[PDB]
Amino acid sequence: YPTVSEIPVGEVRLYQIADGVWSHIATQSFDGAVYPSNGLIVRDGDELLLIDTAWGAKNTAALLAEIEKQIGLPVTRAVSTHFHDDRVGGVDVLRAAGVATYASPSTRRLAEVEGNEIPTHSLEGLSSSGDAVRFGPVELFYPGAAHSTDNLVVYVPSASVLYGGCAIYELSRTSAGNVADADLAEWPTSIERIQQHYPEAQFVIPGHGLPGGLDLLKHTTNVVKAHTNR
Ligand SMILES: O=C(O)c1c(F)ccc2c1O[B-](O)(O)[C@@H]1C[C@H]21
Ligand SMILES: [Zn+2]
Ligand SMILES: [Zn+2]
Ligand SMILES: [Zn+2]
C-alpha cells in the first residue's frame, strides 16, 4: 500500500483493492507535517464513481490525470464524505472537468459556512443517523456525528470494501487527529452503527493511512474514548 515515503509532492497513487475498486492516495502538508489521505474509485459500468477529492486543487488535478493513465475511463460523479478540505478541496477542479459533484445537504451547508468548496448536487435520504441510500455501485451511510457532524461512510457491496473516511483511524494513529469539528460524545455510538450495519465488511479504509479490517473500528473507538478521558 502506498505510503508518504512513496508519494512525491503533488502526486497521486492508486491501489487496486478488487475488480473495479481502487483507493486513491495523496499527501498534503498540515501545520508543517505531511499526511497521507485516501479516497475511493469504483467502476460504474464504463464510467467511474469517485469518493472524495485528493485534498486540494493541485492534487485533484493529478488524481484525474493518474486515473486517465492507469484506468482510462471517465469520472462522471463524485461524492464528498464531509465538508473539510481533504474531502471537498478540489471540487472546483472536478466540476470544471465535467464531473457531477455530490454531498449531503448538511455537508454543503457546512462547506459554505466554512469557506470551502461546495459540491453541486445534494444527496437526499441521509439526514438521520442510521440512514443508508444506494448511489450507483456503492451504498452511502450516515452513521451519526463522529469526526464531523456530517461524516458519511461508503460501502462497496460487490467487493466488501468499507471506506470510513475521517471517522475511522488507521492503526498507526494512537492519539487524536484533527478533532476541531468532532462530536466526541457521539463518535463511539456512530462507530457502533457502522459495525452493526456492515458486519460483513472485509477491507476497511481509513481517511488517512493504511487499510485493515473491521479491527480499525474498535481501534478508533479505543483512541477516541481515550481522548475523551484526557
Ligand atoms: O482526519 C484527520 O484527523 C485529519 C488530520 F489528522 C490532520 C489534518 C486534517 C484531517 O482531516 B480533516 O479534519 O478532514 C482535515 C484535512 C485535515
Ligand atoms: Zn475532517
Ligand atoms: Zn481527515
Ligand atoms: Zn488500536
Question: What structural keywords apply?
Answer:
230 residues, seven-stranded mixed β-sheet, 6 helices, 12 strands, globular, binds the ligand O=C(O)c1c(F)ccc2c1O[B-](O)(O)[C@@H]1C[C@H]21, binds zinc ion, RibonucZ/Hydroxyglut_hydro
Describe the 3D structure.
Belongs to the metallo-beta-lactamase superfamily. Class-B beta-lactamase family. Zn(2+) 4 binds at residues 86, 166, 208. Its EC number is 3.5.2.6. This protein has 230 residues and is of the alpha/beta class. It has one domain (1-230). Helices cover 26% and strands 29% of the residues. The chain has helices at 57-70, 85-88, 91-96, 105-114, 187-197, 215-229, and strands at residues 13-18, 21-30, 33-44, 47-51, 75-79, 100-103, 121-122, 131-135, 138-142, 153-156, 161-165, 203-206. The strands form two sheets. A seven-stranded mixed beta sheet has the order 1-2-3-4-5-6-7. The protein has a five-stranded mixed beta sheet with strand order 8-9-10-11-12, with no helix packed on it. A hairpin with a 2-residue loop joins β1 and β2 (21-30). α5 (187-197) packs antiparallel against α6. It is globular. The relative contact order is 0.14. The structure holds the ligand O=C(O)c1c(F)ccc2c1O[B-](O)(O)[C@@H]1C[C@H]21 and zinc ion (3 copies). One zinc ion binds next to loops.
